[PDB]
């Protein structure tokens, strides 16, 4: 028996080669690895809490846009329509 | 691109062929028609590739081992073959065998006429090869001679593609012996590409393929050919490809 | 032939050095035999066997490669006039233009040989160096590979006080006369210097503009063509396109040298 | 065994960059400039350094300037500087 | 990097010196390069035409060679921002060349992924030696891919048998394939003689595969029982 | 994604260029015994052969056996690797 | 001209694009024209390419971006094992054809999509393949299971009559390591270009 | 007549031993198909001849290397210009007493 991190499972419909069995390969896999990126105002979304919590941090502060990794106008509108939000009830 | 050698007295051999043994159209069929198809088979096969450099020969001794890509080998292998085919035929570039050519067939069957020698070749191209093939006269690293056949275009170079007998037919118990011995010997190879070590050398190439006799000596008579064949051929060729 | 060849018996088999020897003689005689292969390129063919300045076309130097620039972002603008257009990211040397500063260079390089100037070959690149090495046989010239230790031409008595100078016919006969210390210190300067990557020695092209000496140089689309007497607009980065280059050079100069040679003989 | 500095100067560079001596001694004349002592605040203390810059030149339009420098006496300093001149002559239209 | 005046004036510089007598003998250039001239004409030559396509780089369309009215049907009566601006920077930036046949290989091999499998030599050989008479797909000197099908499409364009682009490339992609199809039925035919005539092969493809393969697990399985102990303790 | 380019620095290096080798066979061996014997009482004998092969492991040396060009290639291909423009 | 030489010419017949080189993603065909040289071209560094390639290159097939960057190198990865899949393919004989009743498209504005197979096979359904031993019925294939079963350069589903534990249970996740045998069904190929094999192990 | 330099190395960096390395290249090249089946002058002594004071360990090191492979030509095939070359870079017992016992 072994665990599951030093083990690469190849899909089903996928080629591979003989380095993809290697450990070298699963270290690459590591190391290389939505609505609003969709395109549309993030301003719509206030109403709409369980959507705008997925930009959030488990605590409450919104991320950023080198985490987000959003447009920096869709970032600060979809900051804005957080600010909204919390200042409603609702979020 | 691979192109066919000028012959010397080309212009001569159109006119004529060759004295004996093949006649103008005949020649034609076998060399100034066939060989040129041949060449541009190879060149269309191996025109991007890497192949396209080397010589037939080289090819040949490149790709032997490669299951896949055997159609390269057998053009590869057919134009070397009826090059020496053909140079062993031309009549100039009268000659007799060698002394030490004799001296050397002598030591290898056991001490047999150079007659008899050649009576015993056209018997084995009767028997062996079904079809097309060829018939040479080969030298190994033991230095005494014997005859191969190959079955269509066979090298007689690398033994695995020796193509020396038809498993499409029946074989007998020996014959699968040698196979299995032979097999034993490519996996005991231990290389990447698994190329075993070979030094066999032509001799006498003679061409059983349609492609020389039939014209001239119809459907039958190959024999016929083949014997007249050994009777006119340059043998100051033959002494060159013989001496270490 | 083979003198230390010992030959093994009549009823032993084939020796190893003897098996060698026959599969050479085979090679040399029945190998190279079912075809003949017309149209395809050798590299070691363009070293031995290059082309004269005038047998030279367009189409030629596109096949070595010449026409192939540097890159978009690594432009020098300097280079402007040399270059034909842009495509797959990358400044394309117009090749007419390198055609016909080939050819100055090549008639300059073929004037000096004649002169019985010496002419020196810089390519500090990895492969450039048996290439160079070749040029420099042809003509009777110099070469460097090892790299460019700053000062040769203008601190010359420092760096090359120690080595030995020669005599020379108007032949290139060594008659071999004692040279006088006064006469072995002078500095021998080329007259030519002929460099396959300028912009890796900045260095060379500096002091022969300091120390007076006309230069060639193959300017890529990001090399300042001002820094040397004839530049050849090219692609300096492939091995081959400059053994082209360098192999034309080479061969207009041994032609010079024949041509002077001739004259003297005369 | 043991003007002449001069000579010596043009011998030099002669040596060094194939210039004819002969024309360096005659025809060359020099001409100081500019003669500063100099120094340099080292950790071993002020260390000074004589500076010269001397133009020579061919009155037929040939003109050089050169600048030396010595920690021992002048005479080497100016020596340098005429050196560098005559490295760097120049025809002036 | 500023415009050198000192490398091309070399021979001016020592006809000066060769004048004063600092220079008592001539090098063996000094004739040479007299004889043949440098450049020393560093300039910014502009250009007309981008000569991949042949547009005309200079020309403006004026407003009386646009008579009729333009999309969303506005006649156009005025010169526009752009047709103001001075675009000298466009006569002298060097030209994007672009060909039809790009579009043509991008297709190609989006409809024909595998076809990139084939390895491509890119080492020229003489590209004036060549002939190819594109009536059909095999030539001597070039082997069978995606560029011989998109010449072949060229040529049929050219000659105008199928006036259409895309109808033309279909034609040639379809004279591959059968072409390709006998190509795949030579080698294995090939294979099926050599096999019968007792040929022998002693590594197979597969085979080699999974020699390759075996070498890389076995790496990994020393590799990760050290990674495991790593991991207990 | 947002490229980050540098300005010309005087010279690319790290640090400390870490050469991450592996653990100690000695201390692995150590940590499961205390790892045994926090289980299973002071000292049974499931963790037997386990202390053997502690003791032959640390009998000449408290440790059983005892770097990464890295910058030397960063100081090699600064040069190169710059988007540095023309002289 | 020049231009149209250029257009002709073999850096202009690789077709451009600047997919990534590390792709860790799925990979169910090739992503690069994949590139070899000659011996003598390689022991010279000549890939037909801008620049020389480093002499640590010791490979003669690569596979690449862009001809030259801003960083002074050609972005590329000195490897070709799509065509060694190929070629495996090949080799197993087993000819790819529609589940789906539909005419081959082989035979008779643009469409992007695969035409077909993406030509790995260019192979017809109906033949059948001759030995010494006889006609070959059932295709034997060495592989390697996982967990799915690598066989020849693709995964493929597997079946079988029972499930063997010995092999299985006496090396849970290290069943990679043995080799076993297989009986490949049919090849079927989806719209993303993926190859659907099938296997049966053999024992 | 006219004063020139002897080697056609003269402006590079050690000239002496690169053009002692090019007569080995040029050996090796011409009997680079010779099949292949120790005392070697130092460091010290080929600096003499060599390069001197510019000589480096590198270009010793592939020096060594160049005479080496050619003197592994099997002796059998190899010429007298390549031995010729190589040629350069060559170069108490205590018993027991009368009566039988060792002193020490
Ligand atoms: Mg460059
Ligand atoms: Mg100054
Ligand atoms: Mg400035």
Same mark, same amino acid.
């Given at each position: 028996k072994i665990d599951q991190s030093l083990s690469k499972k190849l899909p089903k419909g996928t080629i591979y080669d003989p380095f993809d069995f290697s450990m070298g390969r699963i270290h690459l896999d590591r190391k290389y690895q939505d609505i609003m990126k969709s395109g549309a105002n993030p301003l719509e979304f206030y109403a709409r809490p369980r959507i705008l919590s997925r930009y959030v941090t488990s605590t409450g502060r919104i991320q950023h846009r080198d985490i987000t990794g959003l447009s920096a106008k869709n970032q600060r509108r979809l900051s804005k329509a957080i600010r909204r939000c919390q200042a409603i009830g609702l979020m | 691109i691979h192109v066919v050698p000028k012959l010397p007295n080309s212009k001569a051999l159109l006119q004529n062929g060759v004295p004996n043994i093949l006649s103008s159209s005949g020649f034609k069929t076998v060399w100034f028609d066939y060989q040129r198809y041949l060449c541009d088979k190879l060149t269309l096969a191996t025109a991007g590739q890497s192949l396209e450099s080397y010589y037939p020969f080289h090819i040949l001794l490149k790709t032997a081992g490669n299951p896949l890509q055997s159609n390269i080998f057998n053009l590869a292998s057919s134009i070397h073959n009826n090059h020496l085919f053909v140079e062993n035929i031309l009549p100039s570039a009268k000659t007799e065998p060698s002394r030490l050519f004799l001296s050397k067939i002598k030591d290898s069957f056991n001490g047999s006429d150079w007659e008899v020698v050649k009576e015993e070749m056209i018997y084995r191209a009767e028997n062996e090869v079904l079809g097309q093939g060829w018939l040479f006269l080969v030298e190994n690293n033991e230095k005494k001679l014997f005859i191969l056949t190959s079955n269509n275009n066979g090298t007689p170079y690398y033994f695995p593609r020796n193509q020396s007998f038809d498993l499409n037919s029946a074989i007998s118990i020996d014959e699968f012996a040698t196979l299995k011995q032979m097999k034993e010997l490519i996996g005991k190879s231990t290389k990447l590409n698994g190329k075993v070590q070979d030094w066999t050398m032509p001799i006498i190439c003679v061409n059983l393929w349609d492609h020389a006799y039939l014209h001239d000596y119809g459907v039958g008579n190959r024999s016929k050919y083949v014997k007249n064949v050994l009777d006119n051929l340059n043998w100051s060729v033959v002494n060159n490809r013989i001496f270490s | 032939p083979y003198p230390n060849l010992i030959p093994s018996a009549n009823d032993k088999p084939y020796s190893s050095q003897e098996l060698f020897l026959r599969q050479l003689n085979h090679s040399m005689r029945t190998a190279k035999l079912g075809a003949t292969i017309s149209k395809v390129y050798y590299p070691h063919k363009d070293i031995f066997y290059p082309p004269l300045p005038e047998n030279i076309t367009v189409e030629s130097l596109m096949s070595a490669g010449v026409h192939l620039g540097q890159s978009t972002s690594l432009w020098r603008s300097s280079t402007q006039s040399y270059i034909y257009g842009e495509y797959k990211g990358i400044h394309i040397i117009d090749l007419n233009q390198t055609l016909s500063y080939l050819k100055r260079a090549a008639k300059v390089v073929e004037g000096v040989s004649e002169s019985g100037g010496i002419i020196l070959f810089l390519g500090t690149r990895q492969g450039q160096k048996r290439g160079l090495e070749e040029a420099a046989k042809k003509t009777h010239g110099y070469y460097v590979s090892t790299r460019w230790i700053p000062g040769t031409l203008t601190n010359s008595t420092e760096i090359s006080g120690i080595w030995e100078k020669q005599e020379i016919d108007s032949n290139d006969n060594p008659t071999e006369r004692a040279l006088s210390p006064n006469e072995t210190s002078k500095q021998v300067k080329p007259d030519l210097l002929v460099v396959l990557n300028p912009t890796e020695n900045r260095n060379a092209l500096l002091e022969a503009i300091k120390s007076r000496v006309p230069t060639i140089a193959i300017i890529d689309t990001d090399s300042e063509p001002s820094l040397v007497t004839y530049p050849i607009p090219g692609n300096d980065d492939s091995l081959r396109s400059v053994n082209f280059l360098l192999g034309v050079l080479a061969r207009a100069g041994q032609r010079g040298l024949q041509n002077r040679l001739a004259r003297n003989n005369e | 065994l043991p003007k002449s500095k001069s000579a010596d100067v043009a011998a030099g560079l002669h040596k060094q960059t194939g210039v004819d001596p002969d024309y360096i001694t005659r025809k060359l004349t020099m001409k100081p400039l500019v003669m500063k002592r100099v120094s340099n605040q080292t950790g071993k203390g002020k260390i000074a350094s004589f500076y010269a810059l001397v133009v020579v030149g061919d009155k037929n339009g040939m003109v050089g300037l050169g600048e030396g420098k010595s920690r021992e006496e002048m005479s080497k300093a100016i020596f340098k500087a005429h050196w560098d001149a005559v490295r760097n002559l120049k025809e002036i239209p | 990097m500023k415009i050198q005046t000192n490398a091309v004036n070399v021979l001016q510089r020592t006809s000066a010196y060769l004048k004063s007598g600092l220079l008592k003998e001539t090098p063996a250039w000094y004739n040479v390069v007299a004889s043949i001239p440098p450049s020393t004409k560093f300039t910014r030559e502009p250009r007309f035409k981008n000569p991949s396509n042949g547009h005309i780089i200079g020309k403006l369309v004026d407003v009386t060679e646009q008579p009729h009215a333009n999309n969303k049907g506005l006649y156009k009566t005025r010169p526009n921002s752009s047709d103001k601006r001075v675009g000298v920077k466009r006569l002298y930036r060097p030209p994007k060349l672009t060909y039809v046949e790009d579009r043509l290989?991008?297709?190609?091999? /989006? !409809?024909?992924?595998? %076809?990139?499998?084939?390895?491509?030599?890119?080492?020229?050989? %003489?590209?004036?030696?060549?002939?190819?008479?594109?009536?059909?797909?095999? !030539?001597?000197?070039?082997?069978?891919?995606? %560029?011989?099908?998109? !010449?072949?499409?060229?040529?049929?364009? /050219?000659? /105008? !048998?199928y006036g259409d682009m895309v109808e033309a490339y279909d034609h040639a992609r379809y004279e591959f394939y059968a072409l390709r199809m006998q190509e795949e039925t030579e080698q294995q035919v090939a294979l099926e003689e050599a096999e019968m005539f007792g040929s022998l092969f002693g590594v197979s493809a597969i085979e080699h595969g999974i020699q390759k393969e075996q070498e890389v697990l076995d790496v990994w399985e020393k /590799?990760?029982?050290?990674?495991? %102990?790593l991991m207990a303790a | 994604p947002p490229v980050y380019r540098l300005p010309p620095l005087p010279r690319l290096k790290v640090k400390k260029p870490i050469i991450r080798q592996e653990a100690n066979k000695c201390l692995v061996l150590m940590s499961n015994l205390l790892q045994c014997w926090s289980s299973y009482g002071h000292m049974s004998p499931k963790c037997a052969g386990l202390v053997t092969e502690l003791k032959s492991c640390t009998s000449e040396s408290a440790l059983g056996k005892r770097k990464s060009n890295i910058n030397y290639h960063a100081a090699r291909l600064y040069d190169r690797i710059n988007g540095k423009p023309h002289d | 001209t020049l231009a149209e030489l250029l257009g002709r010419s073999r850096i202009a017949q690789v077709a451009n694009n600047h997919k990534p080189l590390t792709y860790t993603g799925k990979k169910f065909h090739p992503t690069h024209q994949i590139i070899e040289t000659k011996p003598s071209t390689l022991y010279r560094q000549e890939w037909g390419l801008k620049s020389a390639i480093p002499s640590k290159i010791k490979s003669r097939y690569?596979?690449?971006?862009?001809?030259? $960057?801003?960083?002074?190198? $050609?972005?590329?990865?000195?490897?070709?094992? $799509?065509?060694?899949?190929?070629?495996?393919?090949?080799?197993?004989?087993?000819?790819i054809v529609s589940n789906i009743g539909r005419q081959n498209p082989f035979f008779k504005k643009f469409n992007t999509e695969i035409i077909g197979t993406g030509g790995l096979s260019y192979s017809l359904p109906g033949k059948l393949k001759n030995s010494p031993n006889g006609v070959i019925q059932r295709t034997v294939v060495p592989g390697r299971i996982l967990n799915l079963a690598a066989i020849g350069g693709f995964v493929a589903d597997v079946v079988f009559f029972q499930s063997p534990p010995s092999s299985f249970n006496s090396m849970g996740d290290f069943i990679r390591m043995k080799t076993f045998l297989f009986e490949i069904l049919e090849a079927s190929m989806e719209k993303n270009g993926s190859v659907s094999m099938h296997a049966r192990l053999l024992e | 007549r006219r004063i020139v330099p002897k080697l056609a190395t003269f402006y590079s960096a050690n000239p002496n031993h690169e053009d002692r390395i090019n007569r080995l290249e040029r050996l090796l090249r011409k009997y680079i198909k010779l099949p292949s089946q120790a005392p070697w002058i130092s460091f010290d002594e080929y600096a003499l001849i060599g390069g001197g004071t510019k000589l480096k360990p590198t270009q010793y090191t592939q020096l060594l290397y160049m005479l080496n492979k050619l003197h592994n030509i099997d002796p059998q095939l190899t010429n007298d210009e390549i031995t010729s070359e190589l040629s350069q870079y060559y170069k108490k017992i205590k018993t027991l007493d009368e009566f039988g016992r060792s002193i020490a």
């Open positions: - | - | - | - | 290989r991008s297709l190609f091999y /989006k !409809q024909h992924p595998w %076809e990139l499998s084939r390895p491509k030599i890119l080492v020229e050989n %003489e590209i004036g030696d060549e002939n190819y008479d594109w009536s059909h797909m095999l !030539q001597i000197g070039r082997p069978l891919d995606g %560029e011989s099908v998109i !010449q072949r499409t060229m040529y049929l364009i /050219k000659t /105008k !048998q /590799k990760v029982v050290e990674e495991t %102990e | - | 690569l596979v690449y971006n862009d001809l030259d $960057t801003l960083e002074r190198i $050609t972005t590329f990865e000195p490897r070709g094992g $799509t065509q060694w899949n190929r070629l495996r393919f090949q080799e197993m004989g087993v000819p | -």
